[PDB]
Design a protein around this ligand. Structure first.
Ligand SMILES: [Mg+2]
Ligand SMILES: [Zn+2]
Ligand SMILES: [Zn+2]
Lengths: 77, 69, 900, 56
DNA sequence: ACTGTCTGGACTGGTCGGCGCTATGATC
DNA sequence: GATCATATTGTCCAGACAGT
């Protein structure tokens, strides 16, 4: 089958662990509601098998910095 | 500048920033695998598979007949 | 001390709050009597404030101009529905029990929504969706779970009419009109616990408060009354609307007290409801707007807040300011780019308040002694007590001998003062910059020519605005952040914006071209004119007839820093084989001998070695806007002050060079030999023959249709392609015979002004005139003009101008060119409004975003938009061609510096 | 540690405001200059007493 | 669940100056 | 001939909504 992550427009998506999520929240001094949101019906979310309440680490292909890290919180539809 | 059939310019950026559900004159860029990207015949048959053909464009003229109802 | 506003809490005013905050009760519709005095109990009662200068407020005791005004209240005979809350009233009525009064939801559902509300509270969209879902769930329920009472559907009719579809005894369905009193009684039974489920606050916005019982009349300061030149008072629209409301309410109260039949009561209630609805909003759909006696549709509270001329956009987000000036601008190359020419009359009117200190007591005392009529002087003096004293001839000495530490002197504008210079429209942040005041006797503003591209300002009648900061903090902010030299590089594309223009580019090309030599007198004069700090002339490059001569490259090299090395290809490079040898010589050694470089020097390849222009000529690629590599390198590697000095010197040098050498254009610059004209005519005839052959092939059916298009569009595309190819061939033929000695060709090629196509149109031909990307077709049946035969699809009949500007256009070609020009003008005048609207939308969408101290970009709520701005934390203004760091340039510069 | 343009502008504005209503200059300045010029000279001499509080 | 229909809204900034317009019918 | 109440109630894009 055609994986959703093989597209050039789709960056790598990885589910953060609990300790990784806590460290990310501590680093930026933000709550879980101050992160960008991603819908639970997103193709990347259903491909990763994530559930609402998790934080997805996105490895963007930066035109300026080469590789850039973005974080999105899974929320219900 | 205002105003195939791609209509770029200020209307295009306006449609992009306004998050239009259906952009004017949508265009789909389709690529082919190794079995079809080298020869024109495979590309032509892939295109004719993608392209939607209905009866009204195939017909030359329309005439309603009453004898056969 | 002093306090600031931390937060604003909104809500609906209760009738008790309106009664308590009211200073008087208004019952008399009349405002002024015959004598002009205000009427007690009227809308212009002195208890609500004072407008007339001789009047005194009964609530404040103050005079006009300082009394803030006081609110009133009107006791309505019957309750009325607020038009701004009608949809909310209908939603709450549909979502609540008619007799029980509770929300039509189960206890478990209520608890579930209560817990869900706390999770989604930051995003108002989630709260709106939850409210909509709760309303949809409660709307379909026809039996209240709390009491089991049956419910009926409620129909909402615009603007404030509610219908209940009750059932008769026989089962017939009839619409029952719900009066505002019944609606308010239904809304009063809703408990405070169900209010958060309905989107209302128990203490801030009760549902029953949406039905108005007391109407707060605004203070007279909110609706000022004026007198005309004929003595007739001109009341505000709100005053007339309140007059109508008071009259209708009084009539309704009198009819109620008289025991009038119910039919009259409903009619008066509907009239009062209409008047209140028009008072709240006169542009309500389904309502005839309230009209003045003359037929003017009155504007009300809703119209005073919204729109371009509303309170927000017209008075809050933007407003007129003091200490501002505006006049026509004129060029001035003699002043620096950091300076602005201020008229003496403007300078003597605008004042800057300077406090008297120990180090400026004498200067301010002299300013006070000079007076307002002697420059440099002062107009006003402020004592430490805080009062303002106007300076005149009688008291200028008394104030001057009374001056001490702590006084404020409003002296006239002097040289070196910091002011804001702005041109409208302000599309970008470079439209307002801080300049230095230069006082001039004439009546026009003076702006340096390199600063024009940031303002997009020419001198065909342009006017510009000047603003003088009054506080020390504002002056410091303008001096540090908004100075002209600090914004040479445009943050939009990371390139030069404050750069040289047409005459500077042409003068630089004339000075730095091959074979350009100047005498000792000319070199000394241009050095003095440019302000360069040169005390002795360099060694002469060559001697002619016993007189020393200096090459223009040698004079230009005095501007560059001694440790600057750069090489690139400019716009004048037409022979790459000559640049290839220079590039190979530079690459092979990396420190080429200056004698070796000059042997194979080319004007198309500019090479600067240790601040010496060994080869090349100056063009738009040197210090032009968006293309000047030398200016961009000077800004990045030597700072903004050095770049400002370089620009100020080079502009004057190029201006002197172009002024005294002689630059001109004449009618013979577009002249062409007979052979070129014959070739152009042959090309035009061949194109016409090809078009005719294509038309004949299309008529005979031999034309092959293009994929995705029919025969007509295929023929049109082929004809347009043929005509474009013919125009390109004619342009090439014209360019062949126009050499580098032509001044117009110099201007076009160097990038100073114009294009090669501009010279082509006057020399060879205009080409094909088209509107909206298609050939001209609007006109008669089958023809644009009557002079052509019907059905003619030829080039000449469809807008192909074979003539040129020099040869002269035919009347048909004149009409076609007029059509094209009209299309262009219409396109510009239409595009400007859409571009402005899109810019306003983007500005309002991204106004709050800023970079924090940790590099993140966050909204005011706290949501992180970007964990690092631009994903690399680099300002686009300081980015090298959109990249983070220009590694190759840094490596080359460091290697050259260490090996040189 | 380097000052940003906004921080430098704020410091210069605060110093000029202080000089306008007292706060004698800590360095010798030429006569007839504005308080803003005095604050700029103080910043150039590196004698400013105003510091910047940054989040931590 | 789609699909055509009804309704609401906003219509680039600034500047220049001019030219009108802001009661009426019926007693006493 | 002077005064007095009263004086009427423009295309296009996006969201919500009956109909099949
Ligand atoms: Mg102009
Ligand atoms: Zn008052
Ligand atoms: Zn109930």
């Amino acid at each position: 089958e055609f994986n959703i992550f093989d597209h050039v427009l789709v960056p790598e998506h990885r589910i953060l662990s609990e300790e990784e999520k806590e460290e990310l929240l501590k680093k930026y001094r933000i709550r879980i509601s101050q992160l960008p949101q991603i819908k639970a019906s997103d193709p990347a979310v259903v491909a990763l098998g994530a559930k609402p309440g998790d934080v997805i680490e996105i490895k963007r292909k930066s035109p300026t910095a080469g590789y850039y890290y973005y974080y999105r919180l899974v929320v219900e539809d | 500048t205002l105003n195939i059939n791609v209509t770029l310019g200020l209307p295009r950026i306006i449609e992009i920033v306004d998050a239009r559900k259906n952009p004017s004159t949508p265009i789909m860029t389709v690529y082919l695998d190794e079995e079809h990207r080298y020869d024109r015949d495979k590309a032509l048959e892939v295109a004719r598979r993608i392209e939607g053909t209905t009866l009204e464009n195939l017909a030359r003229e329309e005439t309603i007949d009453i004898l056969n109802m | 001390m002093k306090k600031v506003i931390g937060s604003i809490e909104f809500g609906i005013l209760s009738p008790q709050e309106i009664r308590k905050m009211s200073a008087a009760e208004i019952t008399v519709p009349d405002t002024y009597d015959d004598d002009g005095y205000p009427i007690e109990g009227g809308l212009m009662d002195k208890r609500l404030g004072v407008i007339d200068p001789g009047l005194r407020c009964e609530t404040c005791g103050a005079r006009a101009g300082e009394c803030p005004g006081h609110f009133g209240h009107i006791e309505l005979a019957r309750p009325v529905i607020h038009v701004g809350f009608a949809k909310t009233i209908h939603r709450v009525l549909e979502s609540t029990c008619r007799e029980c009064g509770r929300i039509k939801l189960t206890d478990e559902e209520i608890e579930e929504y209560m817990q869900k509300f706390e999770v989604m509270g930051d995003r108002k969209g989630a709260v709106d969706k939850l409210i909509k879902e709760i309303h949809k769930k409660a709307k379909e329920r026809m039996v209240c779970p709390h009491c089991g009472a049956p419910q009926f559907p409620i129909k909402f009719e615009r603007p404030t009419i509610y219908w209940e579809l009750r059932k008769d005894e026989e089962g017939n369905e009839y619409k029952h009109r719900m009066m505002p009193s019944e609606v308010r009684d239904r809304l009063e039974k809703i408990p405070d616990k169900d209010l958060p489920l309905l989107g209302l606050h128990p203490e801030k916005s009760r549902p029953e408060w949406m039905v108005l019982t007391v109407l707060p009349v605004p203070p007279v300061t909110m609706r000022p009354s004026i007198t005309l030149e004929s003595g007739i008072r001109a009341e505000d629209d709100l005053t007339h609307k309140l007059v109508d409301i008071i009259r209708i309410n009084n009539r309704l109260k009198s009819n109620i007290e008289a025991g009038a039949p119910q039919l009259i009561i409903e009619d008066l209630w509907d009239l009062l409801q209409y008047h209140v609805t028009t008072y709240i909003n006169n542009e309500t759909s389904g309502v005839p707007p309230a009209k003045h006696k003359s037929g003017r549709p009155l504007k009300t509270l809703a119209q005073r807040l919204k729109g371009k001329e509303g309170r927000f956009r017209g008075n809050l987000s933007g407003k007129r300011v003091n200490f501002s000036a505006r006049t026509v601008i004129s060029p001035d190359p003699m002043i620096s780019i950091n300076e602005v020419g201020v008229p003496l009359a403007v300078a003597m009117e605008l004042t800057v308040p300077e406090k008297v200190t120990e180090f400026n007591y004498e200067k301010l005392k002299q300013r006070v002694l000079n007076g307002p009529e002697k420059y440099p002087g002062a107009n006003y003096v402020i004592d430490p007590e805080g009062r303002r004293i106007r300076l005149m001839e009688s008291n200028r000495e008394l104030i001057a001998e009374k001056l001490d530490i702590g006084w404020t002197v409003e002296r006239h504008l002097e040289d070196g003062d910091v002011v804001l210079f702005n041109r409208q429209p302000s599309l970008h942040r470079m439209s307002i910059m801080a300049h230095r005041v230069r006082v001039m006797p004439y009546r026009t503003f003076r702006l340096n020519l390199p600063v024009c591209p940031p303002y997009n300002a020419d001198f065909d009648g342009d006017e510009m605005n000047l603003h003088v900061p009054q506080t020390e903090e504002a002056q410091a902010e303008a001096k540090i952040l908004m100075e002209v030299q600090n914004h040479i590089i445009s943050p939009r594309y990371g390139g030069p914006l404050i750069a040289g223009i047409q005459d500077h580019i042409s003068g630089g090309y004339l000075l730095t071209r091959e074979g350009a030599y100047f005498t000792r007198y000319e070199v000394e004069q241009m050095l003095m004119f440019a302000g360069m700090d040169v005390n002795e002339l360099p060694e002469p490059d060559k001697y002619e007839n016993g007189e020393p001569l200096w090459s223009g490259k040698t004079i230009f090299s005095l501007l560059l820093p001694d440790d600057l090395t750069i090489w690139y290809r400019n716009k004048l490079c037409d022979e790459p084989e000559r640049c290839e040898a220079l590039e190979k010589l530079i690459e092979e050694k990396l420190i080429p001998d200056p004698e070796e470089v000059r042997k194979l020097a080319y004007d198309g390849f500019v090479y600067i070695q240790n601040g010496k222009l060994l080869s090349g000529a100056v063009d738009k690629k040197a210090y032009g806007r968006e293309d000047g590599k030398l200016l961009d390198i000077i800004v990045r590697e030597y700072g903004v002050e050095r770049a400002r000095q370089f620009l100020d010197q080079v502009t004057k040098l190029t201006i002197w060079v172009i002024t005294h050498k002689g630059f001109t254009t004449a009618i013979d610059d577009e002249d062409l030999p007979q052979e070129a004209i014959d070739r152009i005519h042959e090309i035009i005839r061949e194109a016409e023959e090809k078009v005719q052959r294509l038309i004949e092939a299309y008529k005979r059916g031999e034309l092959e249709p293009l994929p995705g298009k029919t025969l007509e569009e295929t023929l049109e595309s082929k004809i347009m392609a043929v005509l474009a190819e013919a125009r390109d061939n004619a342009g090439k033929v014209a360019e062949r015979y126009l050499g580098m000695n032509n001044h117009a060709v110099i201007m076009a090629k160097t990038g100073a002004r114009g294009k090669i196509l501009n010279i082509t149109q006057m020399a060879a031909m205009l080409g094909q005139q088209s509107i909206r990307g298609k050939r001209l077709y609007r006109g008669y049946r089958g023809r644009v003009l009557t002079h052509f035969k019907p059905g003619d699809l030829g080039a000449r009949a469809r807008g192909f101008v074979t003539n040129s500007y020099k040869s002269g256009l035919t009347p048909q070609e004149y009409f076609f060119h007029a059509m094209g020009g009209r299309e262009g003008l219409v396109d510009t005048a239409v595009r400007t409004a859409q571009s402005g609207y899109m810019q306003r939308r983007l500005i309002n969408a991204l106004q709050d975003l800023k970079v924090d101290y940790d590099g993140t970009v966050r909204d005011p709520t706290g949501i992180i938009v970007q964990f690092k701005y631009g994903e690399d934390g680099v300002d686009p203004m300081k980015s090298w061609q959109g990249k983070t760091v220009d590694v190759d340039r840094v490596i080359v510069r460091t290697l050259l510096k260490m090996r040189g | 540690f380097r000052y940003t343009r906004f921080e430098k502008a704020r410091i210069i504005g605060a110093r000029a405001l202080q000089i306008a209503m007292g706060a004698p200059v800590l360095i010798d300045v030429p006569e007839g200059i504005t308080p803003l010029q005095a604050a700029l000279l103080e910043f150039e001499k590196g004698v400013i007493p105003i510091t910047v509080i940054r989040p931590s």
